[PDB]
RNA sequence: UGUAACGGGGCUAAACCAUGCACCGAAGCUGCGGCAGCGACGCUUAUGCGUUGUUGGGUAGGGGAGCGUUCUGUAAGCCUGCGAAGGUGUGCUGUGAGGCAUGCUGGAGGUAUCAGAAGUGCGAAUGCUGACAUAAGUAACGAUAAAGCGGGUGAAAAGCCC
RNA sequence: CCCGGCGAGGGGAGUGAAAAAGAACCUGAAACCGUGUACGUACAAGCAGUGGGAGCACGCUUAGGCGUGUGACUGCGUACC
């Protein structure tokens, strides 16, 4: 029954964890972090692996607007014309080939232009 | 303990204190904190816990165990080393050297290596029924009705 | 496998004479940010670490189009909250290329973070074709 | 007032730049081969050649 | 490695011994007295008789060259533990420390 | 007491109101994983696995379930001076106390069975027994009021001594 | 045996399994420290982050995006009870 406070006490704190720095003296390397505050290290990603994505969305669509602007084919205002066709939905990521494909991608907007434009 | 109570002094005049009682069961030189009471308690058993199908293990095992043979006289005893040769009718050689009979004979020499306290005479002591290979009850029909404890 | 593009340091700089100076100034000083970052050059890293090289030509032409021009102040009080104040206005200060009436990007990268290394890459030499002190190789 | 904030860590223990020293040179000169100092000719009797102060 | 003649035991804190130890490393040893014996603090005097009695061994005691034993480190530890009292407050401040000093010299060569 | 009422920068229409349209889009229902509770089904039934319904933040209360530094016991029983083992950081493993191993090591030791419940699972008792990482080069350094050399000597003299 | 202050401590011998048993006699981490392999770096913001990743002291690979940590850019925030 004698306890002597041990076994599991240095265990719940580091062991194998591939984290060498940690919060310095009176926040951590003394003792103080080990039980109630070592959970914090995921909590900046515990909701956001969703919410972060909004930042980078302008990358992939860049390749269908930067030159297409001077042709008037404006992202938000092209998209109503396009979506009139029920097989043409998933333009989101699948249009990104436009970054190298330019010299024969120039044709793509001919397909329905008579009525589209 | 001998230690100076009860309290010695008035703890003020530092703007830092909390304790000073000395004993108090907590701090140094002592002791057992829990009332210092002698926990002497006979944890009592009831009469028909013995009668009481407790004896019924020999129908659980039935193939290796109670080893029904002959009563105890066969032992030497001044060379008890020899009884390994004679313990072959039960086959057992040395495993758990009991016989669980009814009378005063030379067979107490059995416990020379530890084994168990032997007991023998009528009360077979229930902590000898759980959980050994050789529950030997070996003597005759002296089991009729309340006699089954024996 | 990654969709990301760091450093990039700086891979797309688009060396351009920003002639829009005065004649549609308050339309494109608002979006010199989105140019350094984007709208053409958006194809790599349109939020993080990057650099640009836009070419300055004039400064004292702010145009600005409202009553704001002859009664909006600017304040720095650079030492001990100033005490004794200042009260010059927008078409009177713009006479001097200073730090608040001419860069625009001051107000759009508005604290210093991400802005902390890209102060004078646009040179801010001002004085038309007599003052083309910019890049010798061929700017657009 | 009593000690009531951070230890001598990093920005306190660092402080060494003006605690500094002179990395001075020294003259070999076999006219006084080991009782000598960096130019000062003998640390005790005040020598050069003959009978100076209390030398020879 | 070659020699490690640390001395004991001082009256100062390990800080006072710490301030001159760093100069001597790897491009000086041929004339290792001057710098210390011109900087005559009770500090540098210790480190001065640490060095002599070390390298005067190494040239007789291995058989190496007095000139090339470069002096590759010089580090410092305290201890174990020494106390006294000076009754300023006579139950509070009152107990003055003596941290000691010994200089793990660690010589080796060019 | 630094212009400081959207957070800015005020935008002459980019707006302000009405009418069209598709992008952004909290943890908010969707992709499709795993599944504790109280219910209904196909059957099974010592009972359980999936289907189907209600649905999965948890200090007042009542349910009802995992494990240990080792003591008292599983066991002259098998294990180890061919290492039985920590501080440690090989490799994956549980829904978890944490391990079955292990990696580099130590130099005597164990419970993968279940019987056992109480010196009973610690960092906050304004800490305590003995401490000191700490307050810097931490006295007014012992009032500020005294000193001048030539020496004799020596393991080293502001002092010893002439 | 060898140096130094007719000293302290070590560098090899050595009774010795051992001096990581050496008489500040415990086979043995803890508060705090010194020289260093490389980092970040004398325009600092906001519990000093886990992300997302350039290439760097070093290491394995018939080339195969990994085994390694201070942590350029900045994103997310307020860890307590």
PDB file of N, CA, C and O in Angstrom, chain C residues 74-105:
ATOM      1  N   UNK C  74      -2.657  63.576 -41.133  1.00  0.00           N
ATOM      2  CA  UNK C  74      -1.920  62.378 -40.601  1.00  0.00           C
ATOM      3  C   UNK C  74      -1.039  62.758 -39.342  1.00  0.00           C
ATOM      4  O   UNK C  74      -0.716  63.920 -39.204  1.00  0.00           O
ATOM      5  N   UNK C  75      -0.833  61.817 -38.399  1.00  0.00           N
ATOM      6  CA  UNK C  75      -0.144  61.940 -37.076  1.00  0.00           C
ATOM      7  C   UNK C  75       0.924  60.810 -36.820  1.00  0.00           C
ATOM      8  O   UNK C  75       0.657  59.607 -36.982  1.00  0.00           O
ATOM      9  N   UNK C  76       2.144  61.188 -36.354  1.00  0.00           N
ATOM     10  CA  UNK C  76       3.140  60.227 -35.869  1.00  0.00           C
ATOM     11  C   UNK C  76       3.585  60.316 -34.421  1.00  0.00           C
ATOM     12  O   UNK C  76       3.806  59.262 -33.721  1.00  0.00           O
ATOM     13  N   UNK C  77       3.629  61.553 -33.896  1.00  0.00           N
ATOM     14  CA  UNK C  77       4.037  61.881 -32.476  1.00  0.00           C
ATOM     15  C   UNK C  77       5.187  61.109 -31.989  1.00  0.00           C
ATOM     16  O   UNK C  77       5.124  60.642 -30.849  1.00  0.00           O
ATOM     17  N   UNK C  78       6.211  60.863 -32.813  1.00  0.00           N
ATOM     18  CA  UNK C  78       7.232  59.755 -32.718  1.00  0.00           C
ATOM     19  C   UNK C  78       7.946  59.444 -31.443  1.00  0.00           C
ATOM     20  O   UNK C  78       8.519  58.408 -31.225  1.00  0.00           O
ATOM     21  N   UNK C  79       7.981  60.452 -30.506  1.00  0.00           N
ATOM     22  CA  UNK C  79       8.713  60.394 -29.169  1.00  0.00           C
ATOM     23  C   UNK C  79       7.888  60.047 -27.957  1.00  0.00           C
ATOM     24  O   UNK C  79       7.895  58.894 -27.553  1.00  0.00           O
ATOM     25  N   UNK C  80       7.290  61.080 -27.317  1.00  0.00           N
ATOM     26  CA  UNK C  80       6.482  61.031 -26.089  1.00  0.00           C
ATOM     27  C   UNK C  80       5.063  61.590 -26.266  1.00  0.00           C
ATOM     28  O   UNK C  80       4.749  62.658 -25.778  1.00  0.00           O
ATOM     29  N   UNK C  81       4.289  60.906 -27.082  1.00  0.00           N
ATOM     30  CA  UNK C  81       2.910  61.228 -27.493  1.00  0.00           C
ATOM     31  C   UNK C  81       2.827  62.628 -28.118  1.00  0.00           C
ATOM     32  O   UNK C  81       1.713  63.047 -28.345  1.00  0.00           O
ATOM     33  N   UNK C  82       3.901  63.337 -28.472  1.00  0.00           N
ATOM     34  CA  UNK C  82       3.792  64.570 -29.266  1.00  0.00           C
ATOM     35  C   UNK C  82       3.441  65.847 -28.419  1.00  0.00           C
ATOM     36  O   UNK C  82       4.332  66.684 -28.215  1.00  0.00           O
ATOM     37  N   UNK C  83       2.267  65.871 -27.786  1.00  0.00           N
ATOM     38  CA  UNK C  83       1.889  67.001 -26.898  1.00  0.00           C
ATOM     39  C   UNK C  83       1.428  68.205 -27.719  1.00  0.00           C
ATOM     40  O   UNK C  83       0.236  68.378 -27.935  1.00  0.00           O
ATOM     41  N   UNK C  84       2.406  68.999 -28.150  1.00  0.00           N
ATOM     42  CA  UNK C  84       2.269  69.884 -29.324  1.00  0.00           C
ATOM     43  C   UNK C  84       2.028  69.066 -30.626  1.00  0.00           C
ATOM     44  O   UNK C  84       2.782  68.151 -30.942  1.00  0.00           O
ATOM     45  N   UNK C  85       0.866  69.212 -31.235  1.00  0.00           N
ATOM     46  CA  UNK C  85       0.304  68.432 -32.381  1.00  0.00           C
ATOM     47  C   UNK C  85       0.750  68.916 -33.819  1.00  0.00           C
ATOM     48  O   UNK C  85       1.495  69.868 -33.900  1.00  0.00           O
ATOM     49  N   UNK C  86       0.284  68.321 -34.887  1.00  0.00           N
ATOM     50  CA  UNK C  86       0.483  68.757 -36.281  1.00  0.00           C
ATOM     51  C   UNK C  86      -0.836  68.648 -37.015  1.00  0.00           C
ATOM     52  O   UNK C  86      -1.695  67.900 -36.555  1.00  0.00           O
ATOM     53  N   UNK C  87      -1.069  69.464 -38.062  1.00  0.00           N
ATOM     54  CA  UNK C  87      -2.315  69.686 -38.785  1.00  0.00           C
ATOM     55  C   UNK C  87      -2.224  69.957 -40.253  1.00  0.00           C
ATOM     56  O   UNK C  87      -3.206  70.437 -40.833  1.00  0.00           O
ATOM     57  N   UNK C  88      -1.108  69.633 -41.045  1.00  0.00           N
ATOM     58  CA  UNK C  88      -1.140  69.619 -42.516  1.00  0.00           C
ATOM     59  C   UNK C  88      -2.063  68.506 -43.074  1.00  0.00           C
ATOM     60  O   UNK C  88      -2.330  67.517 -42.392  1.00  0.00           O
ATOM     61  N   UNK C  89      -2.565  68.665 -44.340  1.00  0.00           N
ATOM     62  CA  UNK C  89      -3.533  67.839 -44.977  1.00  0.00           C
ATOM     63  C   UNK C  89      -3.062  67.175 -46.338  1.00  0.00           C
ATOM     64  O   UNK C  89      -1.853  67.327 -46.646  1.00  0.00           O
ATOM     65  N   UNK C  90      -3.868  66.411 -47.131  1.00  0.00           N
ATOM     66  CA  UNK C  90      -3.352  65.418 -48.038  1.00  0.00           C
ATOM     67  C   UNK C  90      -2.673  65.984 -49.330  1.00  0.00           C
ATOM     68  O   UNK C  90      -1.606  65.566 -49.654  1.00  0.00           O
ATOM     69  N   UNK C  91      -3.323  66.907 -50.009  1.00  0.00           N
ATOM     70  CA  UNK C  91      -2.666  67.558 -51.096  1.00  0.00           C
ATOM     71  C   UNK C  91      -1.603  68.553 -50.808  1.00  0.00           C
ATOM     72  O   UNK C  91      -1.086  69.133 -51.725  1.00  0.00           O
ATOM     73  N   UNK C  92      -1.270  68.822 -49.561  1.00  0.00           N
ATOM     74  CA  UNK C  92      -0.166  69.659 -49.055  1.00  0.00           C
ATOM     75  C   UNK C  92       1.117  68.953 -48.566  1.00  0.00           C
ATOM     76  O   UNK C  92       2.210  69.463 -48.785  1.00  0.00           O
ATOM     77  N   UNK C  93       0.960  67.753 -48.042  1.00  0.00           N
ATOM     78  CA  UNK C  93       2.002  66.843 -47.626  1.00  0.00           C
ATOM     79  C   UNK C  93       2.606  66.018 -48.787  1.00  0.00           C
ATOM     80  O   UNK C  93       3.797  65.917 -48.886  1.00  0.00           O
ATOM     81  N   UNK C  94       1.737  65.540 -49.739  1.00  0.00           N
ATOM     82  CA  UNK C  94       2.092  64.764 -50.956  1.00  0.00           C
ATOM     83  C   UNK C  94       3.149  65.341 -51.888  1.00  0.00           C
ATOM     84  O   UNK C  94       3.928  64.663 -52.569  1.00  0.00           O
ATOM     85  N   UNK C  95       3.440  66.675 -51.692  1.00  0.00           N
ATOM     86  CA  UNK C  95       4.484  67.485 -52.254  1.00  0.00           C
ATOM     87  C   UNK C  95       5.859  66.864 -51.931  1.00  0.00           C
ATOM     88  O   UNK C  95       6.716  66.927 -52.773  1.00  0.00           O
ATOM     89  N   UNK C  96       5.951  66.201 -50.797  1.00  0.00           N
ATOM     90  CA  UNK C  96       7.043  65.452 -50.314  1.00  0.00           C
ATOM     91  C   UNK C  96       6.612  63.965 -50.352  1.00  0.00           C
ATOM     92  O   UNK C  96       5.623  63.662 -49.670  1.00  0.00           O
ATOM     93  N   UNK C  97       7.465  63.116 -50.972  1.00  0.00           N
ATOM     94  CA  UNK C  97       7.447  61.620 -50.886  1.00  0.00           C
ATOM     95  C   UNK C  97       7.944  61.198 -49.453  1.00  0.00           C
ATOM     96  O   UNK C  97       9.174  61.191 -49.236  1.00  0.00           O
ATOM     97  N   UNK C  98       7.123  60.897 -48.461  1.00  0.00           N
ATOM     98  CA  UNK C  98       7.534  60.815 -47.042  1.00  0.00           C
ATOM     99  C   UNK C  98       7.445  59.401 -46.484  1.00  0.00           C
ATOM    100  O   UNK C  98       8.486  58.802 -46.193  1.00  0.00           O
ATOM    101  N   UNK C  99       6.231  58.882 -46.168  1.00  0.00           N
ATOM    102  CA  UNK C  99       6.041  57.630 -45.387  1.00  0.00           C
ATOM    103  C   UNK C  99       4.533  57.277 -45.129  1.00  0.00           C
ATOM    104  O   UNK C  99       4.245  56.364 -44.352  1.00  0.00           O
ATOM    105  N   UNK C 100       3.563  58.050 -45.700  1.00  0.00           N
ATOM    106  CA  UNK C 100       2.152  57.964 -45.291  1.00  0.00           C
ATOM    107  C   UNK C 100       1.159  58.429 -46.348  1.00  0.00           C
ATOM    108  O   UNK C 100      -0.027  58.023 -46.307  1.00  0.00           O
ATOM    109  N   UNK C 101       1.553  59.107 -47.424  1.00  0.00           N
ATOM    110  CA  UNK C 101       0.708  59.777 -48.421  1.00  0.00           C
ATOM    111  C   UNK C 101       0.958  59.272 -49.822  1.00  0.00           C
ATOM    112  O   UNK C 101       0.172  59.554 -50.745  1.00  0.00           O
ATOM    113  N   UNK C 102       1.887  58.297 -49.958  1.00  0.00           N
ATOM    114  CA  UNK C 102       2.522  57.854 -51.213  1.00  0.00           C
ATOM    115  C   UNK C 102       2.768  56.343 -51.434  1.00  0.00           C
ATOM    116  O   UNK C 102       2.750  55.830 -52.573  1.00  0.00           O
ATOM    117  N   UNK C 103       3.064  55.568 -50.374  1.00  0.00           N
ATOM    118  CA  UNK C 103       3.315  54.080 -50.491  1.00  0.00           C
ATOM    119  C   UNK C 103       1.995  53.309 -50.754  1.00  0.00           C
ATOM    120  O   UNK C 103       1.918  52.340 -51.518  1.00  0.00           O
ATOM    121  N   UNK C 104       0.892  53.783 -50.219  1.00  0.00           N
ATOM    122  CA  UNK C 104      -0.325  53.085 -49.961  1.00  0.00           C
ATOM    123  C   UNK C 104      -0.183  51.803 -49.113  1.00  0.00           C
ATOM    124  O   UNK C 104      -0.942  51.676 -48.178  1.00  0.00           O
ATOM    125  N   UNK C 105       0.637  50.792 -49.438  1.00  0.00           N
ATOM    126  CA  UNK C 105       0.712  49.436 -48.826  1.00  0.00           C
ATOM    127  C   UNK C 105       0.848  49.433 -47.247  1.00  0.00           C
ATOM    128  O   UNK C 105       0.313  48.493 -46.588  1.00  0.00           O
TER     129      UNK C 105
END
